[PDB]
Amino acid sequence: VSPPPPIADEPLTVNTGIYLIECYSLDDKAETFKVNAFLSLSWKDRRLAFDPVRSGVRVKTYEPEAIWIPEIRFVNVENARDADVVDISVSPDGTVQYLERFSARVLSPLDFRRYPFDSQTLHIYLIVRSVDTRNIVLAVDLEKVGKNDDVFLTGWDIESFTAVVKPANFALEDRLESKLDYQLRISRQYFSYIPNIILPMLFILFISWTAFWSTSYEANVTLVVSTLIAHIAFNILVETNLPKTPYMTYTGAIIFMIYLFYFVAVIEVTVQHYLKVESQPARAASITRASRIAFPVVFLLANIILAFLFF
Amino acid sequence: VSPPPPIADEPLTVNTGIYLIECYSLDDKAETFKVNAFLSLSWKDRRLAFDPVRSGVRVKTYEPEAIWIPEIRFVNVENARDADVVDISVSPDGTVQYLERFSARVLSPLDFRRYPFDSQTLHIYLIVRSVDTRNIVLAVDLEKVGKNDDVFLTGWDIESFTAVVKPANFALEDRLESKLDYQLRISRQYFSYIPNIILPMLFILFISWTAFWSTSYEANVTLVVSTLIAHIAFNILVETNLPKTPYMTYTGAIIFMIYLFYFVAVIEVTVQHYLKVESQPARAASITRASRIAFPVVFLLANIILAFLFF
Amino acid sequence: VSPPPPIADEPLTVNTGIYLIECYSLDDKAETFKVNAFLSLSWKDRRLAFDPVRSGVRVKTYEPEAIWIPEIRFVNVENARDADVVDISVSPDGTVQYLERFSARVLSPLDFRRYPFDSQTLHIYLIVRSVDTRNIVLAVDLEKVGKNDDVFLTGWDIESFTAVVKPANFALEDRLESKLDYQLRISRQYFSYIPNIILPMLFILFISWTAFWSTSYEANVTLVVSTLIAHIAFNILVETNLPKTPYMTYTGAIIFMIYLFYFVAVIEVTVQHYLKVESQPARAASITRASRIAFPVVFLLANIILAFLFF
Amino acid sequence: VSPPPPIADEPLTVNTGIYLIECYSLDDKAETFKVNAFLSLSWKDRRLAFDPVRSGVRVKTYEPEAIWIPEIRFVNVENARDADVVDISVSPDGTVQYLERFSARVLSPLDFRRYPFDSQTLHIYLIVRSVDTRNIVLAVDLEKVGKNDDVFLTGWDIESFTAVVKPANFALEDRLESKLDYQLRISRQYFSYIPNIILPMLFILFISWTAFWSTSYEANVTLVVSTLIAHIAFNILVETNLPKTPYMTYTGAIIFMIYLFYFVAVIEVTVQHYLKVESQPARAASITRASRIAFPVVFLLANIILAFLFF
Amino acid sequence: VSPPPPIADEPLTVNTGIYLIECYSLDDKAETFKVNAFLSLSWKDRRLAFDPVRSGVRVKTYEPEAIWIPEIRFVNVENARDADVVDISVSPDGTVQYLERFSARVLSPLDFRRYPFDSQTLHIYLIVRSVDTRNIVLAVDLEKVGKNDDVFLTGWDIESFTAVVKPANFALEDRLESKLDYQLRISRQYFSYIPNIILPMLFILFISWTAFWSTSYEANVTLVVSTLIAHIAFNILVETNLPKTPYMTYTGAIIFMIYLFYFVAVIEVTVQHYLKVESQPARAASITRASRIAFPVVFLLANIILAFLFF
Ligand code: NI
Ligand code: NI
Ligand code: NI
Ligand code: NI
Ligand code: NI
């Protein structure tokens, strides 16, 4: 088999569509997601044209090996898609209608800068390589691009599944390549982060600040060091659900900043004890009373600055 | 091969049945379960009809490639099912009886709102796409729907395995689609959660309340902060076996609430110490004595409110 | 190909044997184990009978596709076995000798009630479904059931590999099914549990009891709360390599009970401090002296009761 | 099919090229990385030469089975590459242009000596074994060696992808072997290690040094022992993202050294208490004041020595 | 195809060789290792004899399907090897030279008794089953047994790769089997265990011994209990990289022994406090001074005894 011959000099247009059946395993660390979908393909092959009166059939069903089929591939997949041909139908004018159901593990970078209040645009790149006989170009039929209503991605809200209608045509290894960008827009369900991570982390930090209403150095050391220990258990838990980033994240910035608050609280507790031992308690009292206001105020202002820089 | 021709204009009815052989790996985090079952299919193909007197056989056995077989698929599967044809039998009137044994990893959402006292309805969606020649519709043969008595799902009680007899007929990519819903009802075995998670978590909380029978600030700080540390090691264990939900769960609500009790206990311990340093112990004594009753009472009432809202 | 015809009306007997080559990956959490073995099959097919003088051969070697072979399946496997046919030999009287080497992941429930002093009976269920032409029944040739001497299952002692000679014949979807039970008896090597889990867990508990020889409330709080923290680090470890059981395990019972001992020790430490603050030390001293005997005695008796209930 | 015959006695030159499409899963522990790329092959087969005037075609497209293709393998792969032939083009002189898209898991040792400020040279070894008819030699077509601009390896900067143009020709199992070395140079994005590991680890260490401004033995013991506990919860995190190295790593050296600082701090805290109990506080004061300068100074100088030895 | 006929009654000798290309993933817990190697086979098949003068050719090249090839298998593999035939060369006398490149996951038990100063003998068992026509026996061609110089097994030193030249011939399921033992001798690179596990574990133990230079019960309780807590984080980290054994390991013995030292240190700290409260400090002082010598001395002697028993 060889590609359909051009009537003039035009490229062969292969109309595409992806219909999502299942979306699962969005792996934040691996920056992958698994997909199960329908891939629809359509092109004109005049050599397959027939007369409906003479043949007695209005449509002709072929096996993939019997006819020419464009070699359509995905760019950003781990391995080639697991595909099963559902139907191949040829109309009298030779219009081929191809339908396959496939499953694939897709590589798609994630921007964690605004985590856990982030939105992502997952990509599925469709590609076709031109042949020596003729150039093959891809097109999107938007009416054949969609998703099942039941498509759910645990911990995410699915906004839209669309395609950038204009393909990216370029040369690769002395042959033209036609690339389509299918985009799955998702937004993170941040709800659970508030009672499970944000508030417990704030509670232990506020507990360390009770040392500003205590003159007992031994109890203060216990308060600040134990909550810092209680905080270490929380930081590690964050940096095992996310991959190693070259940039600063919203949550990473807050987590780092909270260490400074523990560090300055230890300095305050040390300074307070040192002055009282040095028979300067009136002074230690001024630093401790100022700390009661300074620590929550600086914490609030630093968080407003951070939220502003990130959002 | 082509589909059986209609006598009038009627759709081809494909009778289905699923008999569960094995149920395993209910993954709460992934919201998947693995299944090993028999899939039975039945339809009339008049082109395969025969005379029993002339043929000398009452039933004819065919290989899948020899005859037309409907392309039946599962909607909510990770990859296409691993299937092995067991038998194909044709009766004299042309009624085909197809039997295959398959294994599949099924995507089925779980509602954790009442965890660990939750019940679930797992779904297995059977689907068939109509062909150009004729429309294919699915039906349930209730006599061929069941499960092996030995079918066990570790940590769960299997209630029933039934099918919604009326299919969901709809258009998908300019063709008719007939969908059946097979439902596996299960209820969680909550027993082990009581001695392993609930009671140990309550023990450490009650230990923090012993600070209400102590005037020693340094020992009180040690009691409340250390048990809060012990509590942290328990929340992490629970959350890592469940996915991220946009709603509040029963266990998550209790776990969050217990933090407030640790936080208020620290305030009480701080207030008590502050008043005694300020030479107001009669007052500190009133707050501490009230706390002895308030903390268990508010804990009991808040749990009654939570149990009411969730059940 | 069709099944061998019956001389009278008798069912076709398929003699079976399983010879274990490798046993690996006994997964306690998943309740699975992997197996690599030989599966031998034997049956009489008179249509394959030949004269040795005329044919010039004493044995005939066939390809699986050339002759009729019974569809033998395993009941309790995750997916269908990975099998490779080794040999098919036909004797002059039509006796077929089939041999395949296979590998499979087997689902077999484990009873953890006596863990880590437990024994298990792993099962491999062989099954055959009858055909319309005739009924197929399975048989065990005990001389063809065995295991390689080098077969090792890490952390377990392999006792025996036998088969329940009488098959379980039953009707399933209007056809006879013949099921054989192959049993692999194993006993857990409990040795390492003594120095690695049991004794370290007992050491920290006995360390908490040193608080009964101390009047220092602050040191006592540190002793009991820190060892309870040390006990938490050991419980989590056990409840990860074990599934969520609807019943109570031997180790689970001991682990739960040890919490009560920590809880009562905290009450004692609190009661002791409260009485001394109330200028009643003679009384606190009586409770503390009684606790020195009561705690180890109640611990010993409760363990004797538990060992009796479980063994 | 047989290899192309030599015109004189020359070896057959197979021109190669690798174009990277995807780079993912650089597993530090396993010392592997996954690759998805184009493999281009080119050689002259005179038996396939044709006249463009007579044939009416300027290029001829063949199926892999129709013509002779060199058996090209990768040396350092876990299993054989998953390959799909994209195109086979023959020019009139018989120059074959072969193109396949493949995916493979590559074994490439990593040098962690300078971690997390390390750079690596990943290798992909191409190999061909000579046949009895003639010797096959590999060559690099630099114009067909490259990478997609979007090629990203999470946590790494991709510097270059080049090939050592001269093959390593050698005898292996009584036949000639021609080996090419494709090199992917990468440098680690160390940025995130500073706020997530380096600074938190330094904060807890500096917190232990506050004991040099305290005379309270009980608070000092709490400061140094608790931060050492906090440090233990950091060493474990690093040594589980790397394999077992026979040499010393930069990070491993720092982590080990920090233990000595905790150990000497405990000695100082013990010596200080011992002298004060022995009524020698003037002396304990001299050691404590010296420690305030000695500990940060020795820490800085030891880190300068380490940085010098490693970089 | 059928096996080569015997000239007299002798068994067919199949000469074997394994050449290691890659060694990776030595999994201590699973007791497996992955291998990528060349498997060479050689046997005489007189039916393939030819005259070099008449045929012109000195060697004949065949496709695997064209000639008879012995069914060679590996005993201790998880699944059947992934094999690709490289070459099949037939010499004038009928001597066949077969070469394949394979990859396999090998099951090989590991003796952890001397861990981390252990050496292992990994096994690769080659096997052939005799046929009805004649008996097949295996032999080792030592000239075809080896390994690539670049073969590296991370964390191990590769000593030798040899074969036990004499096969183990035995009857299995009424046929002869010929088994060869290929041995890969390796020794563990223990270096990193010293700064990463051994010394940090010793540091925390020595820190607990500072309690013998302190009269402060509350600081002593903090010293011994906190380092015991710091020790638990080091036993779990070790016993998760190794499987459960029925015997005792070197590292396991040391780890167990260190618990006794923590336990006796708590007794000493308790006895010291008890005597001082009982107005017997002269006696408490004698026990504490003796402990300063006894604890390091008994630790050294117990380690000498352990090293002697294990090495
Ligand atoms: Ni497929
Ligand atoms: Ni299958
Ligand atoms: Ni197989
Ligand atoms: Ni492929
Ligand atoms: Ni292969």
Tab-separated table of C-alpha atoms in Angstrom, chain A:
chain	number	residue	atom	x	y	z
A	1	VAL	CA	0.000	0.000	0.000
A	2	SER	CA	1.023	3.602	-0.815
A	3	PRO	CA	-0.562	7.031	0.101
A	4	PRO	CA	-3.545	8.430	-1.916
A	5	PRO	CA	-2.311	10.346	-5.011
A	6	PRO	CA	-2.915	14.130	-5.161
A	7	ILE	CA	-5.415	15.430	-7.774
A	8	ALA	CA	-3.259	18.613	-8.194
A	9	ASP	CA	-0.283	19.093	-5.692
A	10	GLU	CA	-2.247	19.608	-2.409
A	11	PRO	CA	-1.242	17.913	0.911
A	12	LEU	CA	-3.436	15.098	2.259
A	13	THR	CA	-5.637	16.391	5.095
A	14	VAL	CA	-6.239	13.903	7.909
A	15	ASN	CA	-9.101	15.103	10.164
A	16	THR	CA	-8.679	14.158	13.776
A	17	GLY	CA	-10.665	13.946	16.977
A	18	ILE	CA	-10.021	12.631	20.485
A	19	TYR	CA	-12.919	11.637	22.741
A	20	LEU	CA	-11.850	10.996	26.373
A	21	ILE	CA	-13.409	7.923	27.970
A	22	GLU	CA	-11.157	7.810	31.103
A	23	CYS	CA	-8.612	10.132	32.854
A	24	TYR	CA	-6.646	8.667	35.717
A	25	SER	CA	-3.339	8.518	37.589
A	26	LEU	CA	-2.240	12.197	37.438
A	27	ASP	CA	1.188	11.611	38.995
A	28	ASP	CA	2.519	14.993	40.247
A	29	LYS	CA	6.044	13.610	40.952
A	30	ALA	CA	6.391	11.839	37.534
A	31	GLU	CA	4.467	14.654	35.685
A	32	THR	CA	2.399	11.992	33.857
A	33	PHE	CA	-1.268	11.065	33.501
A	34	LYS	CA	-2.958	8.052	31.968
A	35	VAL	CA	-5.641	8.388	29.290
A	36	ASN	CA	-8.201	6.051	27.668
A	37	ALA	CA	-9.869	7.566	24.619
A	38	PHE	CA	-11.291	7.253	21.105
A	39	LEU	CA	-9.097	8.489	18.273
A	40	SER	CA	-11.039	9.296	15.099
A	41	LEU	CA	-9.323	9.759	11.728
A	42	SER	CA	-10.743	10.837	8.359
A	43	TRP	CA	-9.200	11.296	4.869
A	44	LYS	CA	-10.114	10.904	1.155
A	45	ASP	CA	-8.635	7.961	-0.820
A	46	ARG	CA	-9.963	8.123	-4.413
A	47	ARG	CA	-8.495	4.646	-5.214
A	48	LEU	CA	-11.101	3.190	-2.778
A	49	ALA	CA	-14.077	4.969	-4.464
A	50	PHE	CA	-16.994	2.801	-5.655
A	51	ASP	CA	-20.427	3.007	-7.322
A	52	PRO	CA	-23.249	2.157	-4.815
A	53	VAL	CA	-25.579	0.814	-7.589
A	54	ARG	CA	-22.914	-1.606	-9.076
A	55	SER	CA	-21.542	-2.783	-5.676
A	56	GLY	CA	-24.941	-3.087	-3.945
A	57	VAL	CA	-23.398	-1.574	-0.771
A	58	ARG	CA	-23.602	2.043	0.510
A	59	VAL	CA	-20.517	1.625	2.771
A	60	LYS	CA	-17.515	-0.733	2.658
A	61	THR	CA	-15.794	-2.112	5.773
A	62	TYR	CA	-12.054	-2.866	5.533
A	63	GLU	CA	-9.390	-4.430	7.771
A	64	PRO	CA	-6.456	-2.040	8.634
A	65	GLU	CA	-3.952	-4.158	6.588
A	66	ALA	CA	-6.203	-4.112	3.444
A	67	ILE	CA	-5.961	-0.291	2.939
A	68	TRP	CA	-3.559	2.656	3.372
A	69	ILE	CA	-3.836	4.247	6.840
A	70	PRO	CA	-1.800	7.299	7.986
A	71	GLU	CA	0.884	6.521	10.605
A	72	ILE	CA	-0.446	8.784	13.390
A	73	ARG	CA	1.693	8.963	16.555
A	74	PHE	CA	1.690	10.804	19.880
A	75	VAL	CA	4.723	12.978	20.643
A	76	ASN	CA	4.616	13.117	24.485
A	77	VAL	CA	3.962	9.420	25.350
A	78	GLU	CA	6.189	7.081	27.413
A	79	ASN	CA	5.685	4.165	24.975
A	80	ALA	CA	3.497	3.863	21.819
A	81	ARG	CA	-0.256	3.836	22.581
A	82	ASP	CA	-2.086	0.539	23.162
A	83	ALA	CA	-4.638	0.757	20.341
A	84	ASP	CA	-7.527	-1.409	19.146
A	85	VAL	CA	-9.294	-0.573	15.835
A	86	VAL	CA	-13.088	-0.245	16.409
A	87	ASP	CA	-14.195	0.552	12.797
A	88	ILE	CA	-12.964	1.433	9.275
A	89	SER	CA	-15.736	2.624	6.929
A	90	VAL	CA	-15.374	3.757	3.308
A	91	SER	CA	-18.091	5.854	1.646
A	92	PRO	CA	-18.672	5.785	-2.202
A	93	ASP	CA	-16.439	8.859	-2.874
A	94	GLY	CA	-13.607	7.068	-1.013
A	95	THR	CA	-13.866	9.009	2.285
A	96	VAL	CA	-12.311	6.792	4.962
A	97	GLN	CA	-13.638	6.934	8.537
A	98	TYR	CA	-11.250	5.362	11.011
A	99	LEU	CA	-12.006	4.816	14.718
A	100	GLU	CA	-9.765	3.282	17.377
A	101	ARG	CA	-9.904	3.098	21.156
A	102	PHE	CA	-6.510	3.666	22.771
A	103	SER	CA	-4.817	3.953	26.169
A	104	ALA	CA	-1.550	5.854	26.805
A	105	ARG	CA	0.727	7.243	29.565
A	106	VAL	CA	1.295	10.921	28.722
A	107	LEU	CA	4.335	13.102	29.677
A	108	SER	CA	3.026	16.638	30.445
A	109	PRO	CA	4.985	19.214	32.523
A	110	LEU	CA	3.176	20.711	35.553
A	111	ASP	CA	3.646	24.238	36.949
A	112	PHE	CA	3.611	23.966	40.745
A	113	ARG	CA	4.355	27.733	41.329
A	114	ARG	CA	0.796	28.333	42.747
A	115	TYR	CA	0.349	24.891	44.510
A	116	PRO	CA	-2.171	23.925	45.956
A	117	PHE	CA	-4.180	26.743	44.243
A	118	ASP	CA	-2.833	25.760	40.790
A	119	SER	CA	-4.447	25.109	37.400
A	120	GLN	CA	-2.828	23.013	34.662
A	121	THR	CA	-3.075	22.580	30.903
A	122	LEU	CA	-2.293	18.928	30.117
A	123	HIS	CA	-1.179	18.283	26.517
A	124	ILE	CA	-1.638	15.355	24.120
A	125	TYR	CA	0.410	16.024	20.938
A	126	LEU	CA	-0.825	14.268	17.764
A	127	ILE	CA	1.722	13.928	14.948
A	128	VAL	CA	2.027	12.673	11.334
A	129	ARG	CA	5.170	12.459	9.200
A	130	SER	CA	4.974	13.215	5.469
A	131	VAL	CA	5.954	10.614	2.862
A	132	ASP	CA	8.066	11.081	-0.330
A	133	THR	CA	4.979	10.735	-2.575
A	134	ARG	CA	3.111	13.527	-0.652
A	135	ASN	CA	2.784	15.815	2.370
A	136	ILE	CA	0.339	14.826	5.117
A	137	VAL	CA	-1.270	17.609	7.197
A	138	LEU	CA	-3.484	17.230	10.320
A	139	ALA	CA	-6.802	18.990	11.021
A	140	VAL	CA	-9.137	19.138	14.017
A	141	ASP	CA	-12.784	18.499	13.731
A	142	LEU	CA	-13.944	20.294	16.975
A	143	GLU	CA	-17.324	18.494	16.793
A	144	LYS	CA	-15.321	15.162	17.261
A	145	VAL	CA	-13.288	16.405	20.262
A	146	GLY	CA	-14.857	15.766	23.649
A	147	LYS	CA	-15.091	13.778	26.843
A	148	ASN	CA	-17.505	11.472	28.666
A	149	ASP	CA	-19.506	13.262	31.426
A	150	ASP	CA	-18.301	10.629	33.963
A	151	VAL	CA	-14.576	11.465	33.248
A	152	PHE	CA	-13.112	12.207	36.665
A	153	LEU	CA	-9.563	13.027	37.746
A	154	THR	CA	-9.402	12.506	41.569
A	155	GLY	CA	-8.451	15.766	43.356
A	156	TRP	CA	-9.025	17.890	40.230
A	157	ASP	CA	-11.839	19.726	38.445
A	158	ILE	CA	-11.894	19.137	34.686
A	159	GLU	CA	-12.635	22.450	32.911
A	160	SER	CA	-12.281	21.745	29.191
A	161	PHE	CA	-10.841	19.435	26.574
A	162	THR	CA	-10.064	21.334	23.355
A	163	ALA	CA	-7.619	21.345	20.488
A	164	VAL	CA	-5.493	24.129	18.968
A	165	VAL	CA	-7.082	23.932	15.462
A	166	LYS	CA	-3.984	25.166	13.554
A	167	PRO	CA	-1.275	22.434	13.307
A	168	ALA	CA	2.435	23.131	13.814
A	169	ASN	CA	3.971	22.143	10.460
A	170	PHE	CA	7.788	21.758	10.549
A	171	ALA	CA	10.728	19.796	9.070
A	172	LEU	CA	12.196	16.886	11.085
A	173	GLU	CA	14.929	14.603	9.614
A	174	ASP	CA	14.417	15.899	5.997
A	175	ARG	CA	10.592	15.342	6.063
A	176	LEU	CA	7.655	17.520	6.991
A	177	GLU	CA	5.796	16.854	10.252
A	178	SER	CA	2.242	18.028	11.147
A	179	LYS	CA	1.610	18.428	14.920
A	180	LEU	CA	-1.746	19.055	16.742
A	181	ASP	CA	-2.060	20.188	20.382
A	182	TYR	CA	-4.940	18.644	22.380
A	183	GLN	CA	-5.379	20.498	25.695
A	184	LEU	CA	-7.042	19.211	28.884
A	185	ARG	CA	-7.548	22.137	31.293
A	186	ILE	CA	-7.770	21.175	34.949
A	187	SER	CA	-7.859	23.083	38.266
A	188	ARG	CA	-6.766	21.639	41.611
A	189	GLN	CA	-9.358	21.018	44.366
A	190	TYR	CA	-7.468	22.911	47.158
A	191	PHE	CA	-10.284	22.415	49.799
A	192	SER	CA	-8.723	19.497	51.788
A	193	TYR	CA	-5.319	21.280	52.090
A	194	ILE	CA	-6.907	23.772	54.558
A	195	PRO	CA	-8.007	21.299	57.381
A	196	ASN	CA	-5.296	18.687	56.659
A	197	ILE	CA	-2.074	20.680	56.106
A	198	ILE	CA	-2.470	24.521	56.358
A	199	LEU	CA	-4.403	24.753	59.706
A	200	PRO	CA	-2.443	21.925	61.585
A	201	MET	CA	0.839	23.613	60.492
A	202	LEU	CA	-0.471	27.000	61.725
A	203	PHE	CA	-1.646	25.469	65.069
A	204	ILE	CA	1.856	24.142	65.956
A	205	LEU	CA	3.422	27.527	64.952
A	206	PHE	CA	0.913	29.451	67.159
A	207	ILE	CA	1.690	26.965	69.994
A	208	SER	CA	5.402	27.971	69.754
A	209	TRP	CA	4.296	31.629	70.258
A	210	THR	CA	2.877	30.794	73.762
A	211	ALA	CA	6.591	31.014	74.862
A	212	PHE	CA	6.091	34.836	74.662
A	213	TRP	CA	3.728	34.560	77.709
A	214	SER	CA	6.234	32.427	79.700
A	215	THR	CA	9.343	33.287	81.758
A	216	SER	CA	10.244	29.561	82.208
A	217	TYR	CA	13.329	29.008	79.866
A	218	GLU	CA	13.095	25.176	80.248
A	219	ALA	CA	9.365	25.173	79.242
A	220	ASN	CA	10.070	27.704	76.402
A	221	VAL	CA	12.894	25.506	74.986
A	222	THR	CA	10.403	22.561	75.130
A	223	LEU	CA	7.643	24.655	73.376
A	224	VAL	CA	9.726	25.990	70.444
A	225	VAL	CA	11.968	22.915	69.841
A	226	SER	CA	9.069	20.351	70.067
A	227	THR	CA	6.824	22.313	67.608
A	228	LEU	CA	9.858	22.722	65.261
A	229	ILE	CA	10.138	18.870	65.555
A	230	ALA	CA	6.342	18.659	64.878
A	231	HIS	CA	6.979	20.906	61.789
A	232	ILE	CA	9.790	18.672	60.347
A	233	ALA	CA	7.211	15.802	60.176
A	234	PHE	CA	5.057	18.149	57.991
A	235	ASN	CA	7.728	19.562	55.555
A	236	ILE	CA	8.977	16.078	54.441
A	237	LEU	CA	5.276	15.093	53.822
A	238	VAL	CA	5.008	18.043	51.357
A	239	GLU	CA	8.309	17.299	49.477
A	240	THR	CA	7.245	13.643	48.561
A	241	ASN	CA	4.087	14.592	46.579
A	242	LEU	CA	5.980	17.088	44.343
A	243	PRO	CA	9.057	16.740	42.038
A	244	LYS	CA	12.378	18.680	42.465
A	245	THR	CA	11.670	22.190	41.034
A	246	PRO	CA	14.313	24.701	39.750
A	247	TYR	CA	11.933	27.537	40.885
A	248	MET	CA	10.133	28.538	44.150
A	249	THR	CA	6.565	27.265	44.840
A	250	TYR	CA	3.831	29.039	46.915
A	251	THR	CA	3.684	26.279	49.575
A	252	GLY	CA	7.504	25.867	49.510
A	253	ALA	CA	7.924	29.608	50.189
A	254	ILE	CA	5.519	29.456	53.242
A	255	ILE	CA	7.167	26.238	54.556
A	256	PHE	CA	10.665	27.849	54.276
A	257	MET	CA	9.478	31.098	55.910
A	258	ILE	CA	7.979	29.216	58.935
A	259	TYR	CA	11.571	27.930	59.727
A	260	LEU	CA	12.740	31.567	60.094
A	261	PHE	CA	9.896	32.133	62.591
A	262	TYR	CA	11.063	29.087	64.630
A	263	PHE	CA	14.692	30.275	64.411
A	264	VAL	CA	13.898	33.875	65.544
A	265	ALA	CA	11.637	32.449	68.340
A	266	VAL	CA	14.666	30.405	69.635
A	267	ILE	CA	16.838	33.610	69.527
A	268	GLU	CA	14.111	35.496	71.505
A	269	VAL	CA	13.843	32.621	74.096
A	270	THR	CA	17.709	32.589	74.402
A	271	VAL	CA	17.972	36.455	74.631
A	272	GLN	CA	15.135	36.503	77.281
A	273	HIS	CA	16.943	33.852	79.458
A	274	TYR	CA	20.380	35.501	79.007
A	275	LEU	CA	19.122	38.953	80.158
A	276	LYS	CA	17.274	37.533	83.227
A	277	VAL	CA	20.487	35.611	84.276
A	278	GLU	CA	22.376	38.952	83.727
A	279	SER	CA	19.854	40.690	86.109
A	280	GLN	CA	18.269	42.732	83.251
A	281	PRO	CA	14.600	41.398	83.382
A	282	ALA	CA	12.943	44.814	82.658
A	283	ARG	CA	14.708	44.689	79.222
A	284	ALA	CA	13.871	40.951	78.610
A	285	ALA	CA	10.230	41.887	79.422
A	286	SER	CA	10.259	44.643	76.715
A	287	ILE	CA	11.580	42.190	74.040
A	288	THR	CA	9.026	39.476	75.079
A	289	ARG	CA	6.049	41.952	75.081
A	290	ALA	CA	7.140	43.332	71.639
A	291	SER	CA	7.497	39.720	70.319
A	292	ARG	CA	3.813	39.012	71.244
A	293	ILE	CA	2.761	41.617	68.627
A	294	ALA	CA	5.776	41.439	66.198
A	295	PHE	CA	5.624	37.644	65.503
A	296	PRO	CA	1.870	37.475	64.397
A	297	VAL	CA	2.119	40.903	62.613
A	298	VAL	CA	5.348	40.042	60.647
A	299	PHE	CA	3.787	36.588	59.882
A	300	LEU	CA	0.612	38.218	58.466
A	301	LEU	CA	2.518	40.885	56.421
A	302	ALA	CA	5.063	38.324	55.069
A	303	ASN	CA	2.138	36.095	53.943
A	304	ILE	CA	0.413	39.112	52.243
A	305	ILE	CA	3.766	39.871	50.443
A	306	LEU	CA	4.099	36.160	49.390
A	307	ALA	CA	0.441	35.902	48.192
A	308	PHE	CA	0.996	39.126	46.181
A	309	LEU	CA	4.248	37.841	44.546
A	310	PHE	CA	2.625	34.471	43.621
A	311	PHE	CA	-0.957	35.542	42.659
